[PDB]
Design a protein around this ligand. Structure first.
Ligand SMILES: Cc1cc2nc3c(=O)[nH]c(=O)nc-3n(C[C@H](O)[C@H](O)[C@H](O)COP(=O)(O)OP(=O)(O)OC[C@H]3O[C@@H](n4cnc5c(N)ncnc54)[C@H](O)[C@@H]3O)c2cc1C
Ligand SMILES: Cc1cc2nc3c(=O)[nH]c(=O)nc-3n(C[C@H](O)[C@H](O)[C@H](O)COP(=O)(O)OP(=O)(O)OC[C@H]3O[C@@H](n4cnc5c(N)ncnc54)[C@H](O)[C@@H]3O)c2cc1C
Lengths: 602, 606
């Protein structure tokens, strides 16, 4: 009688309606799993609580990847962004990453609409306080209303809410976010099963009133024209560029002054709070600040670079010492949030818990910070939760093929000491894992899982085919050029390696060029970088070998000859899925890898 | 150092971004007062937490009045409403009242957008935990972040938040609303100043998934065509009707069954007037076999359905059972459970009809915190409190709305003169001038005050005056144009105006007698309504002549009731506590005897 009815039983239960939860719930539901997404306040689904932006150095590529796998974040920002630009634009297209300013309000509504109308997905406003487990297998969930719902798998994405404490000056206020409640009960479930629990703390700037800011002397920071898109599926379909002339808004730049730093001092690894970095870098005389609009209708301005947790009275003084903000009025005070986190090392690269079958974690609760890093994990967790529910085998993303894979690999293999951010990761395949080819690297898996339709993948296969045609064509079409006082014969493909664009080649030599925007650009990029991709691949050949060497899930590390005791210990807890992953465990020696390889018969 | 800077000093501080707070903050700001609107979550400004509707029996007229005074509610629902209709459409236009279904989401956004861009208005996301007083005069406000802001007046509209507790079965959860935090500290200020504090409790239904409901056999409930508008200012300007063909959505009807009722009885335990919770009205009306239920959409993008008539605070597992016993909902899935909220309330008897506190000058109260419940009742008080707060800030005298001229005035009068033992609702009030205070003439009754305060622009009022003049020209025209009619086998000479009381409409008079009619939509309809009801309005006015007499008799603010001869001791105790501003209001205090009123009239030299 405390048990919900048949009509209230699910395959997958996602705890959380944030960035991880949304991708997870949408992925599972779209794969056919009857999914329930629990949320503390149904009106906050999809809410952006920090920076009003999507994308960035590594973040932007992850979004592109989420979009390729069949997720929503990419489509959401394309439809609700108010500014788009490319970062690292002076060093070749391969190192670039897209970034956009979002209209927070429109973004939230967009995600709520897609979620509400998603077939097989049900939203439940209720606080989950416990997970029901039978023989290390997830079988249900309980809320603080004394009810229980049956489920086959659970994806936890409590974000910054679990036992959240808001910090402002010496005031401590319970909550998952400023002005919102926090969750509590679920933490007892984790202690009860002996899961390690740690607390992370991150801050956010105050929210400023646009009418009280003098922008007159500030430098304008505009978008790009034509602006890049995050989704391969939005209009223009099969392309990553918006039409030239798309309507965009501005951002403004200002800086801290020595007076700002003195105010902070009087009131006293990657610590972003202005207060922290003036102590970490006592010598920098000024710190850059980006004033960002929060939407087209709102007057709130997000001052990027001024996150703090100082008392509100001090916030007034420090914010008003910044040129342009002399008379600024705060709408929302800056603050810092501390919450519960379960160390990622408790998971396999499938995001599934080692202790309990059918339990997956994602987002800030998993030790990361950021919308994108959360959404990237969420889609994987959602995918695997559905698979589990269907009695199939969970998958994982190889770090040598996607940035989502790199992130997940570092979390579950290295663990975290502080919140993980995508820009701290080091991809050994940075030339292959680019912004322009997420679609080519992940679309197959996306279609395989059923997230992409037959039609979506058909477009991908076609373009991929067109691309290969032209590459083989330009590689067979030679041309004679006068290099100084001597004459040479080079193929068009090779000319791309010598500062020629396809447009240059057509203009000077009259050759033809792909008419499809994507094929046209992707061909140029692949030919220009072929030399480096091949060299990069050559250098990591040994990493590739290890990565392709699977380790039995039923492997008894105690029966392996030539493996130290301290090694069996680590290999016993991390439980690597491949020898390549096993070699990344901090502390394992090249010898151990050998013993293991020998034992595996290689 | 804990004190906010000069740039953070205000004339008026409104605590709350709800329905009372929005009208109060916008009114004061539009009147020129530097205004700060505090709220717990800036993203919840203008949020509708209960029924997704605006209007109804008395509520609809109050919206028309808010709009006539220069408020926003009217404009808001007109731009975000997805269904509009008139109630009591078979009993003459005088007893009709507008009602609309709102797209909750669009409505919230609309209010947030207007408030954010309103000049002189500043939004502050922060919890006010104390009000600073100097010689019984509001001087500032303090928040839970240890900071203070200077202000000259404060409007408190905590709604259902102050020490709010959510109820579901046996569970008690702190919160101002399901999924939202509650406020607490401010209650200390009131105990500290010895204010009386009571707790009211109201419930709301669950939110249902539209795709799990079978509407196949349910009665459809559409809007009207043409649909009525709430604002006189939205397009078509200077009119109360939308064009024919406006796109609207439907609502659906269902009923409870005997099985539904038996489900509630098995799960009800004993515990020590208007109790809308289905579970209460079946114990209060044991003989009713079925209860009507209106299934209404909450917006165009959302799949959430609001089951009007099924508010409850029963355990969630019991809710599943009762909701599923209702035809069409056999397999319904809840998105949000039903619950009841209990919050702090300061008895309205602590205020003058101006909504200002008798104990502290510059302090005003409005909305649920004031003892009422409903969006419209809150916004009605809000605009008044906002207006008076700004006036106070400027050193001018606060105003009040006479109950014989507006329904808002009726509400405020009843609240401050009768007090409340339960949440006050607009349909329970009784206007002795129900024929004068109509839905069609709110604009004619309140536009002058609206313009006088600065809420309406010169151009807005100019329109009202022009129409007001055309209306009068037409009435005098139809009053001098006689026609001949055959009352049986007899011939009579009647003025066109008289025919309006003999079942003739202006359209009938033109079609049959060929007379001209007004071309402006409002003039054309108001002339007809005014002529048709002139007889009753005059009779109503004659029957209340005495009431008008008493209401026009002002009572000095500093009268010493102890010095009035011929006044009982129990009568002086009521007069000293309620402190009526007119003899009319005084005669409305429960217990006051006709003799006591005479002694007072004599004392005032009458
Ligand atoms: C103060 C602050 C500072 C930040 N700083 C940074 C930064 O420096 N850099 C950066 O990139 N990003 C930052 N962020 C953004 C942050 O990473 C995201 O807000 C979010 O936490 C990430 O996505 P998520 O899915 O994990 O969680 P969230 O978006 O937070 O969502 C969690 C969801 O879980 C639900 N929930 C929690 N518990 C329960 C329960 N028991 N039952 C049901 N539902 C539950 C909540 O209702 C909520 O919808 C910051 C955010 C805040 C609030
Ligand atoms: C459970 C429930 C049952 C209901 N039942 C009915 C019904 O039967 N009939 C009907 O017509 N209507 C009903 N309603 C609707 C209700 O009348 C409105 O939701 C609202 O309370 C009325 O307007 P308001 O302005 O007074 O308050 P609200 O709209 O509730 O707003 C209050 C505002 O005050 C702010 N606040 C509170 N404390 C502080 C503080 N210390 N500092 C700063 N800000 C603060 C909050 O953030 C909030 O924005 C119900 C609502 C609920 C939640």
């Amino acid at each position: 009688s405390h048990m919900a009815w048949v009509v209230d039983e699910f395959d997958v239960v996602v705890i959380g309606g944030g960035h991880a939860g949304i991708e997870a719930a949408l992925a599972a539901a779209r794969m056919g799993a009857k999914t329930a997404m629990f949320v503390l306040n149904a009106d906050t689904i999809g809410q952006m609580s920090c920076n009003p932006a999507i994308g960035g150095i590594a973040k932007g590529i992850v979004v592109r990847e989420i979009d390729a796998l069949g997720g929503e974040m990419g489509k959401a920002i394309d439809q609700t962004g108010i500014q788009f630009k490319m970062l690292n634009t002076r060093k070749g297209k391969a190192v670039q990453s897209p970034r956009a300013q979002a209209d927070k309000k429109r973004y939230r509504e967009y995600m709520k609409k897609v979620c509400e109308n998603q077939e097989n997905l049900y939203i439940k406003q209720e606080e989950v306080v416990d997970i029901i487990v039978k023989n290390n297998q997830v079988v249900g969930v309980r809320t603080n209303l004394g009810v229980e719902y049956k489920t086959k798998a659970v994806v936890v994405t409590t974000g910054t809410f679990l036992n959240g404490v808001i910090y402002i000056g010496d005031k401590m206020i319970p909550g998952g976010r400023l002005g919102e409640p926090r969750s509590e009960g679920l933490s007892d479930f984790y202690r009860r099963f002996d899961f390690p629990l740690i607390r992370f703390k991150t801050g956010t700037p105050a929210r400023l009133d646009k009418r009280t800011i003098d922008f007159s002397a500030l430098e304008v920071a505009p978008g790009d024209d034509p602006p890049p898109k995050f989704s391969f599926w939005t209009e223009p379909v099969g392309s990553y560029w918006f039409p030239k002339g798309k309507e965009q808004v501005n951002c403004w730049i200002t800086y801290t002054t020595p007076k700002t730093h003195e105010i902070i001092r009087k009131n006293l690894r990657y610590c972003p709070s202005i207060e922290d970095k003036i102590v970490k870098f006592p010598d920098k005389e000024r710190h850059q600040i980006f004033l960002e609009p929060e939407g087209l209708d709102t007057i709130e301005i997000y001052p990027n670079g001024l996150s703090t947790s100082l008392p509100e009275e001090v916030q007034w003084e420090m914010y008003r010492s910044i040129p342009g903000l002399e008379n600024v009025v705060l709408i929302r005070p800056a603050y810092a949030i501390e919450y519960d986190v379960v160390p990622p090392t408790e998971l396999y690269p499938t995001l599934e818990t080692k202790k309990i079958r059918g339990l997956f974690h994602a987002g800030n609760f998993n030790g990361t910070t950021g919308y994108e890093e959360a959404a990237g994990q969420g889609i994987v967790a959602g995918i695997n939760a559905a698979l589990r529910a269907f009695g199939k085998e969970p998958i994982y993303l190889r770090r040598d093929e996607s940035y989502i894979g790199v992130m997940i690999d570092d979390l579950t293999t290295k663990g975290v000491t502080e919140p993980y951010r995508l820009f701290t990761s080091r991809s050994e395949y940075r030339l292959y894992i680019r912004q322009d080819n997420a679609i080519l690297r992940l679309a197959k898996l996306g279609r395989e899982l059923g997230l992409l339709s037959e039609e979506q993948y058909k477009l991908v296969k076609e373009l991929e085919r067109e691309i290969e045609k032209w590459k083989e064509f330009y590689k067979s079409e030679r041309v004679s050029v006068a290099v100084g006082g001597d004459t040479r014969s080079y193929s068009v493909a090779t000319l791309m390696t010598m500062n020629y664009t396809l447009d240059d080649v057509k203009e000077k030599f009259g050759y033809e060029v792909p008419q499809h925007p994507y094929v046209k650009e992707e061909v140029e990029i692949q030919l220009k970088y072929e030399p480096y991709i091949e060299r990069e691949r050559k250098l990591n050949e040994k990493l590739k070998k290890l990565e392709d060497t699977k380790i039995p899930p039923d492997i008894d590390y105690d029966k392996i000859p030539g493996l130290t005791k301290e090694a069996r210990e680590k290999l016993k807890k991390f439980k690597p899925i491949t020898v390549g992953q096993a070699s990344r465990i901090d502390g394992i020696t090249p010898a151990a890898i050998t013993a293991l390889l020998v034992y595996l018969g290689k």
